[PDB]
Design a protein around this ligand. Structure first.
Ligand SMILES: CCCCCCCCCCCCCCCCC[C@@H](O)O[C@H](CO[C@H](O)CCCCCCCCCCCCCCC)COP(=O)(O)OCC[N+](C)(C)C
Ligand SMILES: CCCCCCCCCCCCCCCCC[C@@H](O)O[C@H](CO[C@H](O)CCCCCCCCCCCCCCC)COP(=O)(O)OCC[N+](C)(C)C
Ligand SMILES: CCCCCCCC/C=C\CCCCCCCC(=O)OC[C@H](COP(=O)(O)OCCN)OC(=O)CCCCCCC/C=C\CCCCCCCC
Ligand SMILES: CCCCCCCC/C=C\CCCCCCCC(=O)OC[C@H](COP(=O)(O)OCCN)OC(=O)CCCCCCC/C=C\CCCCCCCC
Ligand SMILES: CCCCCCCC/C=C\CCCCCCCC(=O)O[C@H](COC(=O)CCCCCCC/C=C/CCCCCCCC)COP(=O)(O)OCCN
Lengths: 99, 114, 129, 303, 113, 98, 347, 70, 83, 105
């Protein structure tokens, strides 16, 4: 209720200000007179996406540290980070991060 | 399939503990130290019976014992307790650390008195 | 009742799915899917799934609808089923999600292997030649 | 009185942006052995008002063939996100108290690229689209390391609650526990807002400008709360408010200083900077900050 | 060269030690809060059971009043074969009550920020 | 099964039908799979939260991740097809026939 | 590609299939399917050409739609019973969703349209992999939940698959499309006995895999993908054409060849359940598969087609690379009928 | 000199003072002169609901002390 | 030895970021297995009561189980306090 | 088909996640945990056919707890009859159901 109302107020103020900005100078009359598709940008977007997926898994790490199984949790967190590093290394050594 | 039996409204009438959560948090440690036996009876009955309708008299007992605890507090050191709870009530997270001095005064009063 | 806010959210969800399912001007379909994702995030958050709703809204929207838009630009009854008790001094959703490392070792292993293989597969497919 | 609180949060932020324009001009001028605007107003104080009035009166050049819907929506989304991301922040008491406030801020930041994408696509120009694609790629690339650094730092806070950061830093600042992560975070926040040396790119133009400067102030305040924990006394929050505001102002002036001090990168050079210097160190320090509380038996409380 | 790295490592170690002490203190404070909650729990459980039973009995009485004209209705009839007590559903307690407190019990914790 | 579940199910059905239409623009096909997975995530999250099944709180995120990985591959495929024709039209993929 | 990457992708495909086969949780089965699909695409695109890219994108679209349908079935089954274990479904709607997802993954009619095109687009080794290894996981899942399936729907799709394979193979000159239609017909034969006996399903699967491996390795050895290209093999390798003719006779179900073992057994099993009409129609329709196998045999080994002059140079060279298991595959696909009772091993 | 920059900064500082302070003051006006109670984890919410019920005026912040025990 | 020293000296020049990252990651992997405070962290996590401690029904054969928290028998937290 | 590697090796790769009543973290209890436990204990080792025909009572209760369809039907019937009576005017809600009661802690 509070968050929805705050969002509505923010959007309403932004809309009001943009429309008044777009219509204040409209009252007075004036004169009123390709293909390339480079492959590297798609690859950086996909790398960001793959990395983003890895980011979600860790997200729970702050809570994962209270389990009484600290050894297993530490091992799996380090495994996830090592595999993220391995993805970065593989894309590095295969000329995936070049321009 | 069957009729669910419920206690009457008279069975659920009890002399209630009408103090706020700040007062309860201020008293909680000594309350757990003093009123432990009825509380454990109630909770053991509650996890064994798995039924609220089978635990009502123990709940009445814990209410009575809490009332007795607060009557003792009221009789011997009302002022020390009031100052301590004022501090607990002020904080939004109701942290014990924020008002250590008030707690210390309260602890000394109860030991001498009770 | 607030005239079944969950029901109207689900109705907006269905309306948005109808909107982008006609597939007009894939940028417009993408924007319809973004609106549908926001509404579904609102549904999950209003249900009580704060972390999962924020995961939708962050990962889903900010990463992968973003990548879809990037690639496209490069080219040419409620309130009743709910509970009665409380959770304690913690949120059950966070603990269950949090439990994957302690409990879900197998899931972590298979998911990490799949993601590494996915990186390799993407690079190999886009290699060209 | 929640609406009054919302207005008292929103209006001062826009006023602060308006006068941050003047502050930046005057700071750059005095760093360049000259004066800034000192004519419009007693000390240049009327300059932002004159700029706003001139911009709001000048003709808006709509491309006359561009997508009207997105051409209007992009500044709306920019302003909405810039004003929304102030809600989560605690100064000391937050307007809205969120359990996962940090995650909410991250999600808003992730959304912020849609305005860039839509404004670039609407312009109906190949060159503008190329520039927008550059900007989007840089923004997503750096938000990766922003997220990783953020979780590595929060592994010492105990949760995603922004208020708990005040409790974490009651004795010492988080800058001393992890300065390298703070350095990389500062550079990534520079890159995220497209500020120099990473600045490779009527009404709606002013709207975008306001959104960008609001994000600048917001990011600096977030850094101040995250790494320079001000002491908070529950019976006098004005001390915390003043201290936090001073630290935010110092960080904003540091952005201005960095703008006035350095040349700018190439696109491939900043891509390489990130993907080959920050991400490896970020992953290594993420492992280190996962291991450290367990090694030293210093795990934060909340679960 | 060596001095700058040494300064960095030294301040890192100082921060690590300080936060070790502070986080252990925070753990002890959290354990104290949990102990207070544990001490207070039985009274809250008793009150919760008694409140739920009262609401169920009130709903049963109102059902007895209302259903007097329905032919095949049985007042207070379970839908489960088992005689075991089942935790009541949220619609069972606030079904006949006013909208404001229904929305309260449903979304008060979710919407409270 | 209340009305919210049926709304999410019919959303999934609408997305599946839209995918099976294929007017043009294989990007739209990917978008339809994407809406399908989003509906799956929403309904699985609702079911798991309602029943208080604590452990399966993992599986929505996992689902997302895996589906998202799939999306990446699809995009790659789309891109490569465009590299052959200059457009992602569905009707260009008629070299192989029954 | 790099041999290391190729081996990694092959083991990832096998690990996905294995994950599907050994798990008891529906989420893990779905994950195994996802892993298999993810690692399968580069194998189909190992040799780069537009046709292979088209085949891979069609295969991905089909398999991703099937995976989404399968996850929908899983979630509905969870909704009507909070169970994650792969067992009887407990929901009529969920079972249908699951059956259609697995039929789409297998290529059963009316979801058969992708198989001929994908097989034609990809190379011969990719086709061997696609038609042999990619049927294990869906069929294993079907075997696990066979007590749930509606016999009407499964039998309808089985008969449709047999009819479609028989009719579609009659019109083909390309060898890969012939193999695809043959695989569709054999899948139809396999899925018609799931409601009654999963052991017969597994026996048919094993026999079909053996024959398909032999036929694909023979087609790779004599590097032909058309009828006329295969018609030249007698002028260089007549023994290969003879072995191919015997294998084709076996694939048509003639006794005393190995290919007679499944259908016979399946027919026998279906008779124990008072099902008479359906096996009769299945055999009559399999006569079509036999017809186009016989046409291939006529064009390859039973008659001598004209050759070219450059073939003389090919007379001076021998194969550098050999399949070790090709003789064993041929023998197991032609001469194992006397060992039929060994099917009690629950293969 | 350089202090010519100070005026505008001061103004900006004031604009950054308004939100924080305002919230604090409002959090005292709407919560009876105390900090606004924070409710994570649903146990603090239960405590707030109990206080709201036992207040007798339908406001949780009104605290019933030891004088209410009779 | 000598070749390893040459390689490390050559990498420490012109690639210091990678050397630092690999060293920090290796330390993060190795050090936890040797620290004596990891078991202390596990014990601290075990001592955090999130749930109500359900009492056990006394049957006359439970000497190690306390009847009251103040009783000497039962787990103590003096090691935690001294930390 | 199903190769039960976990049973042969005693691994427990994914069985921890299959049912509601299997050792949730922090001993959190599932809403339908009691019903599922009874259904499982009824049907253990008996086999699928006999479990489906003989443990139908427990599964029906478990299903009811999971979806609460019959409870919805009963509540809707009560609300609809109450609405009919209040529209006719021969029934009046008590002060408890109008928010005029005396709340209890
Ligand atoms: C034995 C057969 C070996 C050859 C076959 C290998 C097959 C492929 C390899 C992957 C399978 C590895 C098996 C691991 C299964 C996990 C379950 C088991 O190991 O126990 C876990 C032990 O986890 C340990 O951390 C094992 C660590 C192993 C994972 C790290 C590296 C794995 C890499 C394997 C392949 C990944 C990709 C390739 C990398 C090169 C659970 O620990 P615990 O907490 O007590 O119990 C939880 C239940 N509680 C909550 C009630 C207490
Ligand atoms: C056409 C010829 C095909 C030949 C097949 C390939 C031959 C090479 C195989 C190499 C040796 C295979 C033996 C495997 C070693 C251990 C076996 C163990 O792991 O599996 C057991 C069982 O192993 C196999 O069942 C036995 C395979 C034997 C296949 C031969 C029968 C084929 C029909 C007769 C045709 C003539 C073939 C003989 C000439 C070579 C237990 O299985 P179980 O976990 O409990 O349940 C899974 C099966 N269910 C689901 C159906 C119940
Ligand atoms: C815009 C951002 C939308 C979500 C904002 C809030 C998200 C959040 O994390 O908090 C939700 C907040 C507090 O949650 P906790 O942190 O867990 O603490 C409360 C318990 N003490 O509570 C709420 O859920 C309030 C909002 C729920 C109902 C409405 C949700 C929003 C719906 C938005 C629909 C519109 C989408 C439009 C398309 C979006 C495309 C970018
Ligand atoms: C809030 C705090 C803010 C702190 C930062 C304030 C900024 C001060 C003003 C300067 C910033 C100006 C911004 C301009 C951008 C500068 C970015 C930059 O150039 O960094 C690049 C730079 C190197 O790149 P190149 O020189 O181009 O060559 C690499 C290819 N061979 O990248 C880096 O080095 C990033 C490193 C960040 C700091 C990390 C250093 C830590 C190393 C040792 C730490 C050890 C701790 C481990 C635990 C100890 C256990 C024993
Ligand atoms: C066991 C710990 C593992 C986890 C820690 C790692 C986490 C994150 C770090 C890894 C990220 C991925 C790394 C990918 C490696 C690719 C490097 C590379 O290819 O760069 C080479 C050059 O870099 C190299 O030389 C390869 C690595 C060099 C060695 C780096 C450190 C290795 C280990 C040193 C310390 C080991 C442990 C401590 C020893 C010191 C004493 C304590 C070429 O550079 P370009 O930019 O492409 O072009 C420049 C030429 N024009």
């Amino acid at each position: 209720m509070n968050i929805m109302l705050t969002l509505l107020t923010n959007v309403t103020l932004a809309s009001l200000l943009v429309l008044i900005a777009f219509w204040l100078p409209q009252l007075n009359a004036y004169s009123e007179k390709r293909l390339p598709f480079s492959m590297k940008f798609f690859l950086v977007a996909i790398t960001f996406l793959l990395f983003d997926l890895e980011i979600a898994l860790l997200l729970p790490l702050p809570w994962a540290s209270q389990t009484n199984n600290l050894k297993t949790m530490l091992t799996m967190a380090l495994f996830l980070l090592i595999l993220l590093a391995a993805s970065l290394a593989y894309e590095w050594t295969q000329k995936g991060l070049e321009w | 399939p069957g009729i669910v039996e419920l206690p009457t409204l008279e069975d659920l009438k009890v002399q209630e503990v009408k103090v706020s959560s700040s007062v309860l948090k201020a008293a909680a440690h000594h309350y757990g130290a003093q009123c432990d036996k009825p509380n454990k009876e109630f909770m053991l009955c509650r996890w064994e019976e798995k039924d609220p309708r089978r635990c009502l008299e123990e709940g009445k007992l814990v209410n009575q014992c809490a009332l007795d605890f607060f009557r003792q507090i009221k009789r011997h050191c009302a002022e020390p307790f009031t100052e301590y709870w004022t501090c607990i009530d002020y904080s939004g997270l109701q942290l014990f650390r924020h008002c250590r001095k008030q707690q210390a005064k309260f602890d000394e009063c109860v030991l001498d008195k009770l | 009742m607030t005239m079944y806010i969950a029901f109207i959210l689900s109705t907006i969800f269905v309306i948005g799915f109808v909107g982008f399912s006609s597939k007009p001007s894939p940028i417009y379909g993408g924007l319809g899917l973004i609106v549908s994702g926001g509404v579904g995030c609102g549904i999950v958050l209003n249900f009580g799934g704060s972390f999962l709703g924020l995961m939708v809204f962050l990962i889903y929207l900010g990463g992968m609808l973003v990548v879809f838009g990037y690639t496209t630009a490069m080219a040419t009854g409620d309130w009743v089923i709910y509970d009665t008790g409380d959770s304690g001094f913690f949120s059950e959703e966070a603990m269950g999600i949090a439990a994957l490392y302690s409990y879900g070792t197998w899931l972590v292993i298979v998911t990490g292997w799949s993601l590494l293989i996915g990186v390799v597969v993407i690079m190999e497919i886009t290699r060209g030649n | 009185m929640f609406m009054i609180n919302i207005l008292s949060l929103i209006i001062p932020i826009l006023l602060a942006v308006a006068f941050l324009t003047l502050v930046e001009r005057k700071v750059l001028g005095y760093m360049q052995l000259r004066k800034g605007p000192n004519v419009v107003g007693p000390y240049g104080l009327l300059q932002p008002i004159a700029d706003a009035l001139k911009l709001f009166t000048k003709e808006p050049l709509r491309p006359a063939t561009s997508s009207i819907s997105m051409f209007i929506i992009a500044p709306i989304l920019a302003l909405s996100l810039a004003l929304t991301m102030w809600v989560p922040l605690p100064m000391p008491y937050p307007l809205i108290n969120m359990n996962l406030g940090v995650l909410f801020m991250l999600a808003m930041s992730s959304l912020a690229v849609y305005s860039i994408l839509w404004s670039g696509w609407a312009s109906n120009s190949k060159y503008a689209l190329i520039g927008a694609l550059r900007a989007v790629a840089q923004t997503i690339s750096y938000e990766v390391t922003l997220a990783i650094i953020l979780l590595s730092v929060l592994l010492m806070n105990g949760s995603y609650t922004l208020s708990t950061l005040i409790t974490t830093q009651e004795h010492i600042w988080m800058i001393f526990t992890s300065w390298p992560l703070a350095m990389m975070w500062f550079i990534s926040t520079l890159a995220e807002t497209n500020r120099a040396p990473f600045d490779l790119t009527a009404g709606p133009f002013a709207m975008f400008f306001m959104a960008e400067y609001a994000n600048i102030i917001m990011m600096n305040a977030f850094t101040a709360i995250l790494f320079l924990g001000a002491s908070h006394d529950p019976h006098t929050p004005e001390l915390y408010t003043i201290n936090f505001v001073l630290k935010t102002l110092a960080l904003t002036i540091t952005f201005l200083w960095i703008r006035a001090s350095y040349p700018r990168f190439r696109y491939d050079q900043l891509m390489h900077l990130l993907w080959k210097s920050f991400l490896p160190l970020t992953l290594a320090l993420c492992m280190w900050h996962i291991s450290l509380p367990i090694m030293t038996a210093s795990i934060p409380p909340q679960s | 060269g060596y001095s700058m790295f040494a300064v960095g490592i030294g301040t890192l170690l100082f921060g690590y030690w300080s936060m070790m002490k502070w986080n252990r203190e925070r753990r002890r404070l959290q354990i104290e809060d949990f102990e207070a909650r544990i001490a207070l729990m039985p009274l809250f459980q008793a009150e919760k059971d008694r409140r739920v039973l009262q609401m169920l009995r009130e709903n049963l009485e109102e059902e007895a009043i209302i259903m007097k004209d329905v032919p095949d209705w049985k007042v207070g009839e379970s839908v489960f074969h088992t005689t075991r007590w089942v935790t009541p559903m949220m619609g069972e307690l606030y079904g006949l009550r006013t909208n404001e407190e229904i929305l309260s019990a449903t979304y008060g914790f979710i919407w409270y920020t | 099964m209340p009305l919210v579940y049926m709304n999410i199910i019919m959303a999934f059905a609408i997305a599946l039908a839209g995918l099976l239409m294929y007017r043009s623009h294989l990007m739209s096909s990917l978008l339809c799979l994407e809406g399908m997975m989003l509906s799956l995530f929403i309904m699985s999250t609702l079911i798991i939260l309602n029943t208080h099944f604590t452990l399966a709180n993992m599986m929505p995120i996992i689902l997302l991740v895996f589906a998202a990985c799939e999306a990446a591959l699809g995009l790659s495929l789309l891109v490569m097809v465009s590299n052959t024709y200059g457009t992602d039209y569905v009707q260009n993929l008629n070299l192989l026939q029954c | 590609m790099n041999p290391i990457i190729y081996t990694t992708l092959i083991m990832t495909v096998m690990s996905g299939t294995m994950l599907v086969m050994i798990s008891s949780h529906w989420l893990l089965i779905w994950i195994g399917f996802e892993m298999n699909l993810l690692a399968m695409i580069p194998v189909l695109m190992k040799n780069f050409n537009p046709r292979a890219t088209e085949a891979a994108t069609k295969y991905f679209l089909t398999q991703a739609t099937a995976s989404m349908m399968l996850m929908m079935a899983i979630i509905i089954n969870l909704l009507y019973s909070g169970q994650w274990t792969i067992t009887k479904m407990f929901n009529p709607v969920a079972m249908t969703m699951m059956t259609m997802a697995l039929a789409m993954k297998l290529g059963l009619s009316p979801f058969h349209f992708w198989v001929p095109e994908v097989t034609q687009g990809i190379s011969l080794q990719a086709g061997l992999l696609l038609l042999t290894w990619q049927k294990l996981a869906p069929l294993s899942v079907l075997c696990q939940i066979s007590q749930s399936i509606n016999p009407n729907l499964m039998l309808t799709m089985a008969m449709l698959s047999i009819l479609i394979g028989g009719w579609g193979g009659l019109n083909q000159t390309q060898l890969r499309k012939i193999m695809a239609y043959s695989s569709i017909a054999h899948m139809g034969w396999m899925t018609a006995v799931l409601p009654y006996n999963t052991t017969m399903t597994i026996l048919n699967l094993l026999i079909y895999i053996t024959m398909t491996l032999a036929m694909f390795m023979l087609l790779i050895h004599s590097s032909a993908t058309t009828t006329l290209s295969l018609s030249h093999t007698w002028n260089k390798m007549p023994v290969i054409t003879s072995l191919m003719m015997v294998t084709l006779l076996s694939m048509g179900g003639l006794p005393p060849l190995s290919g007679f073992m499944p259908k016979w057994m399946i027919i026998q099993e279906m008779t124990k359940n008072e099902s008479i009409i359906m096996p009769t129609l299945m055999a009559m329709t399999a006569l079509l598969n036999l017809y186009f196998y016989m046409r291939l045999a006529y064009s390859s080994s039973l008659t001598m087609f004209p050759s070219t002059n450059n073939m003389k140079m090919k007379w001076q060279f021998e194969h550098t690379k050999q399949m070790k298991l090709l003789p064993t595959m041929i023998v197991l696909s032609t001469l194992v009928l006397p060992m039929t009772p060994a099917l009690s091993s629950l293969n | 000199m350089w202090f010519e920059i100070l005026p505008g900064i001061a103004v900006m500082a004031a604009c950054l003072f308004i939100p924080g302070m305002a919230t604090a003051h409002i959090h005292k006006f709407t919560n009876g002169g105390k900090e606004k109670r924070v409710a994570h984890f649903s146990y603090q919410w239960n405590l707030m609901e109990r206080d709201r019920r036992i207040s007798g005026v339908n406001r949780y912040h009104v605290t019933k002390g030891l004088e209410n025990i009779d | 030895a000598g070749r390893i020293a040459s390689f490390l000296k050559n990498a420490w020049a012109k690639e210091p970021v990678l050397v630092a990252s690999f060293a920090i990651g290796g330390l993060a992997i190795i050090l936890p297995s040797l620290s004596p405070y990891t078991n202390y962290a596990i014990r601290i996590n075990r001592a955090t009561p999130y749930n109500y401690p359900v009492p056990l029904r006394d049957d006359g054969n439970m000497p190690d189980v306390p009847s009251h928290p103040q009783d000497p028998q039962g787990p103590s937290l003096e090691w935690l306090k001294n930390l | 088909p199903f190769f039960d590697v976990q049973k042969r090796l005693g691994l427990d790769l994914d069985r921890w996640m299959t049912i509601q009543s299997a050792e949730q973290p922090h001993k959190i209890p599932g809403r339908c945990h009691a019903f599922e436990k009874e259904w499982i204990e009824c049907a253990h080792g008996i086999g699928g056919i006999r479990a489906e025909k003989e443990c139908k009572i427990e599964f029906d209760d478990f299903v009811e707890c999971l979806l609460r369809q019959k409870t919805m039907k009963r509540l809707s019937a009560i609300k609809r009859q109450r609405d009919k009576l209040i529209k006719e005017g021969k029934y009046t809600p008590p002060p408890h159901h109008l928010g005029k009661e005396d709340p209890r802690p």
